[PDB]
Amino acid sequence: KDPQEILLNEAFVVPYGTPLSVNFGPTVDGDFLTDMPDILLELGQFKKTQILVGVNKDEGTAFLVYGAPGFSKDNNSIITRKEFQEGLKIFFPGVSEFGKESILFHYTDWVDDQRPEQYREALGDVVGDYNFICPALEFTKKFSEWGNNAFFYYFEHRSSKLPWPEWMGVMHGYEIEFVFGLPLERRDQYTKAEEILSRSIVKRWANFAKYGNPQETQNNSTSWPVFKSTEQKYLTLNTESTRIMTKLRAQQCRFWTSFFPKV
Amino acid sequence: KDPQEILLNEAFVVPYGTPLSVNFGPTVDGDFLTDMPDILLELGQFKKTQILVGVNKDEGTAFLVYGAPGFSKDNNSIITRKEFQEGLKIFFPGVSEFGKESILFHYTDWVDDQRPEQYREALGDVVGDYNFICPALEFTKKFSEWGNNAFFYYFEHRSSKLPWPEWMGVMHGYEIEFVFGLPLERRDQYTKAEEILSRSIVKRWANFAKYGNPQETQNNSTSWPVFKSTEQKYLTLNTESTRIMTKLRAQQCRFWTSFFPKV
Amino acid sequence: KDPQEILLNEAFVVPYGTPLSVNFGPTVDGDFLTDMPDILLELGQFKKTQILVGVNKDEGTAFLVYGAPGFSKDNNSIITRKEFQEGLKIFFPGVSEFGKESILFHYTDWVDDQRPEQYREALGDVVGDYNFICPALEFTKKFSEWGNNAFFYYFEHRSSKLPWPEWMGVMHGYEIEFVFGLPLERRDQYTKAEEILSRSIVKRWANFAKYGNPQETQNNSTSWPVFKSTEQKYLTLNTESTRIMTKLRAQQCRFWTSFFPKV
Numbered sequence: 089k090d091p092q093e094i095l096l097n098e099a100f101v102v103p104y105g106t107p108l109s110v111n112f113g114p115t116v117d118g119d120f121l122t123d124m125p126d127i128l129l130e131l132g133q134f135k136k137t138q139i140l141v142g143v144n145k146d147e148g149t150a151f152l153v154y155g156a157p158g159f160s161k162d163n164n165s166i167i168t169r170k171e172f173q174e175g176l177k178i179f180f181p182g183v184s185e186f187g188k189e190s191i192l193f194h195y196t197d198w199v200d201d202q203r204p205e206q207y208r209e210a211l212g213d214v215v216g217d218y219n220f221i222c223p224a225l226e227f228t229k230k231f232s233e234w235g236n237n238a239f240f241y242y243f244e245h246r247s248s249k250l251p252w253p254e255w256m257g258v259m260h261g262y263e264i265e266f267v268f269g270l271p272l273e274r275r276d277q278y279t280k281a282e283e284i285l286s287r288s289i290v291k292r293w294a295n296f297a298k299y300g301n302p303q304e305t306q307n308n309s310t311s312w313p314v315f316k317s318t319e320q321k322y323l324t325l326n327t328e329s330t331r332i333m334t335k336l337r338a339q340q341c342r343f344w345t346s347f348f349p350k351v
Numbered sequence: 352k353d354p355q356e357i358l359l360n361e362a363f364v365v366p367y368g369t370p371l372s373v374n375f376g377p378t379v380d381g382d383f384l385t386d387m388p389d390i391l392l393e394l395g396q397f398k399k400t401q402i403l404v405g406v407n408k409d410e411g412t413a414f415l416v417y418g419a420p421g422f423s424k425d426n427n428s429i430i431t432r433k434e435f436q437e438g439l440k441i442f443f444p445g446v447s448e449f450g451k452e453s454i455l456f457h458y459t460d461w462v463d464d465q466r467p468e469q470y471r472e473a474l475g476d477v478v479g480d481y482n483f484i485c486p487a488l489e490f491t492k493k494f495s496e497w498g499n500n501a502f503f504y505y506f507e508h509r510s511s512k513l514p515w516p517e518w519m520g521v522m523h524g525y526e527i528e529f530v531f532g533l534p535l536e537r538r539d540q541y542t543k544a545e546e547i548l549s550r551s552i553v554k555r556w557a558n559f560a561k562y563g564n565p566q567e568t569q570n571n572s573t574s575w576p577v578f579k580s581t582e583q584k585y586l587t588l589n590t591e592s593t594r595i596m597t598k599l600r601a602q603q604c605r606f607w608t609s610f611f612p613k614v
Numbered sequence: 615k616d617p618q619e620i621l622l623n624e625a626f627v628v629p630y631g632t633p634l635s636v637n638f639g640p641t642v643d644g645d646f647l648t649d650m651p652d653i654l655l656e657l658g659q660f661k662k663t664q665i666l667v668g669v670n671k672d673e674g675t676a677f678l679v680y681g682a683p684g685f686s687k688d689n690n691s692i693i694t695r696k697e698f699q700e701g702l703k704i705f706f707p708g709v710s711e712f713g714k715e716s717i718l719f720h721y722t723d724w725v726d727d728q729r730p731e732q733y734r735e736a737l738g739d740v741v742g743d744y745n746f747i748c749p750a751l752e753f754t755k756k757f758s759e760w761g762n763n764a765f766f767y768y769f770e771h772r773s774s775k776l777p778w779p780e781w782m783g784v785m786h787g788y789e790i791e792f793v794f795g796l797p798l799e800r801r802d803q804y805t806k807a808e809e810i811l812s813r814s815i816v817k818r819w820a821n822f823a824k825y826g827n828p829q830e831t832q833n834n835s836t837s838w839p840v841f842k843s844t845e846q847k848y849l850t851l852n853t854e855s856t857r858i859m860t861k862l863r864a865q866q867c868r869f870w871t872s873f874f875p876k877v
């Protein structure tokens with residue numbers, strides 16, 4: 089077959105896709121991957137070395153405009169309860185009714201004003217916590233239980249040049265340009281504070297690669313503590329103040345990690 | 352003398368007052384107070400029991416409009432470096448030039464954009480950290496070193512009905528109405544979220560008085576951990592999310608507590 | 615160029631030198647030195663082995679007669695406050711006025727008699743603590759935090775044959791002849807007690823090189839304890855009594871190490 093014909097048909101090999109559909113991805117091949125990876129991770133079979141792991145504040149939002157009803161990059165995407173329910177259908181196509189109600193339940197006990205943005209925000213969190221944040225935090229706990237140093241960050245700066253709308257917040261993919269040092273180029277219309285954040289991140293990544301320890305040691309910076317099961321400290325990355333915090337998304341991940349998999 | 356004549360002359364018994372002038376306050380009388388209290392605190396001579404201690408996010412701002420030049424409750428109070436320097440004169444009347452430059456130094460290493468509000472914000476912090484926040488945190492460390500449980504909070508909600516302007520933030524005195532439960536009165540034009548914050552605070556204060564432990568135990572609330580020297584955990588009080596944080600104002604209080612007193 | 619012409623011009627490559635001017639010294643070349651060394655030290659990138667580190671009691675004095683006003687090797691160098699201030703100019707040429715006042719402040723709170731030698735002594739200490747003693751003690755703490763044994767000494771014997779005057783005390787460079795065993799030569803007009811001190815030092819250095827442990831094990835000598843962050847024990851070297859002491863120059867080094875670098 090010519091390549092186009094393979095590509096054109098890729099989208100349909102699946103009965104129903106989601107916006108995060110991975111039609112063709114990694115498998116347990118007996119070669120690159122000798123067993124189910126959940127089992128390797130659990131039983132400590134992996135390279136012993138240091139890791140640096142992190143997530144952005146609004147991982148799930150990018151995906152809502154590729155299919156969830158009531159969403160648009162061109163308006164404020166205030167959605168109703170019903171639209172929320174329909175969005176869960178779109179993101180959780182093979183899940184029992186009870187599976188879906190349980191998500192609705194975990195994410196809609198409002199605190200508390202009847203804010204119009206309640207449902208729009210809950211859907212972004214749902215998508216981001218299940219698909220990105222809770223699996224990242226779970227890999228870091230399990231990896232670190234076998235003795236190696238790990239460091240965990242939570243990126244909460246929204247690029248001043250972001251072409252997406254405000255409601256989508258600190259989006260998935262939009263730390264990359266900080267890590268690669270784009271805002272160090274003064275000609276580029278990023279702010280002074282963005283220049284400084286990128287410089288500090290670039291230093292911490294570089295020190296991690298060279299020395300295994302993602303510190304910025306010269307400019308009175310906050311020390312990045314190791315992530316240990318038990319305390320679960322992480323470092324926030326932002327323009328205002330860098331903070332040491334504990335137990336990211338603790339209630340949400342208990343839901344995704346210990347209950348949802350049974351469903 | 353008639354009372355008016357005593358009152359009229361109270362303001363002048365002092366060569367130069369500040370907006371926080373306490374012309375007539377507590378003294379070491381040999382009776383109520385048997386020694387200099389700094390010495391009692393240091394050497395562990397005080398009632399052994401539990402304490403609950405806290406501060407508001409912008410303690411110092413209320414005072415800037417009673418004398419600092421360039422300030423007004425009726426505009427945004429953008430001040431220059433020079434006006435800052437003059438404000439230090441107003442707040443630190445008996446202090447050497449070097450004493451004042453040292454404050455300027457600690458508080459004006461900008462991060463970093465040349466934001467117009469830099470000087471206005473630094474002056475509020477200066478006034479609040481010296482007069483309220485660092486002495487509160489220091490009393491709590493010293494008290495807790497002798498064995499008793501202590502709990503520390505940082506109140507960061509600005510009342511929706513605050514008649515003062517926005518720049519003044521979470522002002523000194525404006526937690527009181529939350530503690531006394533004014534926003535529980537639905538007729539009063541506070542928001543739903545304010546109602547819930549006040550209800551939770553009132554419960555925590557009440558449980559502290561009855562049981563010595565300022566927990567809200569029924570509504571999946573964040574546990575308030577004891578404040579210990581070493582970890583120095585505190586609880587944030589706000590409408591969005593309640594957090595456990597460590598070492599409030601650590602760099603600023605090291606300045607006020609260990610250096611400024613020598614000056 | 616002929617060598618003389620390079621040498622003649624070396625002194626002027628610098629806008630203003632101090633008596634400790636190092637016009638041409640080590641650099642981060644990418645070769646011998648792969649990164650800024652403060653960063654290597656902080657992050658534990660160095661040979662892991664034992665170290666022996668120390669300083670003399672009056673490191674800074676030798677330098678005062680190469681430029682500080684009011685100093686002379688031929689008189690008692692009683693200087694005034696003003697001369698002190700001028701000496702700080704000579705030793706701290708690129709430092710802000712505030713930087714200089716802060717030194718004056720740390721070093722001139724007299725205890726307390728108005729002794730005429732107050733200013734002369736404070737200037738020697740200033741020069742010695744900043745340039746030699748606090749950096750030595752800081753390298754030893756940081757080195758030892760990564761697990762290796764370290765030993766720290768404070769040499770306080772003034773050679774009986776010292777051609778410099780008395781006020782200059784236990785000068786920089788004048789332990790060397792003890793380490794190399796010059797006073798073991800009985801023909802040389804050093805005292806009996808100096809002979810014994812040199813013999814003990816030579817033994818301790820030799821045992822350190824051979825065995826990693828700078829003990830003198832045969833003559834009922836004081837054991838030299840390892841220097842650990844936390845306790846910070848050191849050994850004094852003198853003719854009368856050898857002592858174990860803690861936290862050399864603790865108040866002065868807190869000044870040089872944690873505050874002065876910001877200035």
Ligand SMILES: *[C@@H]1O[C@H](CO[C@H]2O[C@@H](C)[C@@H](O)[C@@H](O)[C@@H]2O)[C@@H](O[C@@H]2O[C@H](CO)[C@@H](O)[C@H](O)[C@H]2NC(C)=O)[C@H](O)[C@H]1NC(C)=O
Nearest residue numbers: 153154155156157158159160161162163164165166167171
């Ligand atoms: C925000 O936009 C969405 C997205 O759909 C629309 O895109 C808009 C920018 C709009 O101008 C229109 O061209 C396009 O249909 C709106 O969702 C749509 O809602 C309308 C109701 O009139 C329905 O016809 C559609 O079913 C629905 N489309 C999808 C894909 O869900 C949404 O109402 C709007 N919300 C606002 C302004 O809050």
Ligand SMILES: *[C@@H]1O[C@H](CO[C@H]2O[C@@H](C)[C@@H](O)[C@@H](O)[C@@H]2O)[C@@H](O[C@@H]2O[C@H](CO)[C@@H](O)[C@H](O)[C@H]2NC(C)=O)[C@H](O)[C@H]1NC(C)=O
Nearest residue numbers: 416417418419420421422423424425426427428429430434
């Ligand atoms: C904000 O207001 C201050 C306060 O002083 C003024 O109050 C204003 C609301 C104003 O309308 C006027 O009635 C009153 O004087 C301003 O500070 C003043 O600045 C002016 C410069 O024109 C000086 O004349 C005064 O010295 C000074 N007063 C004091 C007490 O400091 C300030 O300039 C203004 N700032 C803004 C708009 O950013």
Ligand SMILES: *[C@@H]1O[C@H](CO[C@H]2O[C@@H](C)[C@@H](O)[C@@H](O)[C@@H]2O)[C@@H](O[C@@H]2O[C@H](CO)[C@@H](O)[C@H](O)[C@H]2NC(C)=O)[C@H](O)[C@H]1NC(C)=O
Nearest residue numbers: 679680681682683684685686687688689690691692693697
């Ligand atoms: C100690 O000596 C200094 C050094 O300067 C002088 O050296 C002396 C030994 C002296 O005999 C003279 O030959 C030479 O000038 C004295 O400092 C000098 O003070 C004089 C005041 O008469 C000034 O003329 C100089 O500015 C100053 N020189 C320098 C280089 O600073 C100092 O007064 C003297 N102190 C004593 C005796 O306590």
Ligand SMILES: *[C@@H]1O[C@H](CO)[C@@H](O)[C@H](O)[C@H]1NC(C)=O
Nearest residue numbers: 284287288289291304306307
């Ligand atoms: C450290 O120093 C200055 C700010 O005072 C700045 O130019 C530089 O970017 C900082 N370095 C890092 C790695 O953040």
Ligand SMILES: *[C@@H]1O[C@H](CO)[C@@H](O)[C@H](O)[C@H]1NC(C)=O
Nearest residue numbers: 547550551552554567569570
């Ligand atoms: C607990 O329960 C409900 C919210 O579900 C609320 O009415 C009440 O105020 C809460 N109680 C406290 C003490 O916060």
Ligand SMILES: *[C@@H]1O[C@H](CO)[C@@H](O)[C@H](O)[C@H]1NC(C)=O
Nearest residue numbers: 810813814815817830832833
């Ligand atoms: C030990 O013994 C004698 C003194 O009793 C002396 O001659 C010798 O120098 C001492 N040795 C050392 C290494 O100090």
Ligand SMILES: [Cl-]
Nearest residue numbers: 169170173192
């Ligand atoms: Cl329903």
Ligand SMILES: [Cl-]
Nearest residue numbers: 138235236237
């Ligand atoms: Cl490790």
Ligand SMILES: [Cl-]
Nearest residue numbers: 319334335595
């Ligand atoms: Cl915690």
Ligand SMILES: [Cl-]
Nearest residue numbers: 432433436455
């Ligand atoms: Cl200035």
Ligand SMILES: [Cl-]
Nearest residue numbers: 401498499500
């Ligand atoms: Cl108790």
Ligand SMILES: [Cl-]
Nearest residue numbers: 332582597598
């Ligand atoms: Cl911490």
Ligand SMILES: [Cl-]
Nearest residue numbers: 695696699718
């Ligand atoms: Cl003076």
Ligand SMILES: [Cl-]
Nearest residue numbers: 664761762763
């Ligand atoms: Cl060792």
Ligand SMILES: [Cl-]
Nearest residue numbers: 845859860861
């Ligand atoms: Cl001690």
Ligand SMILES: [K+]
Nearest residue numbers: 145146244592
């Ligand atoms: K968040």
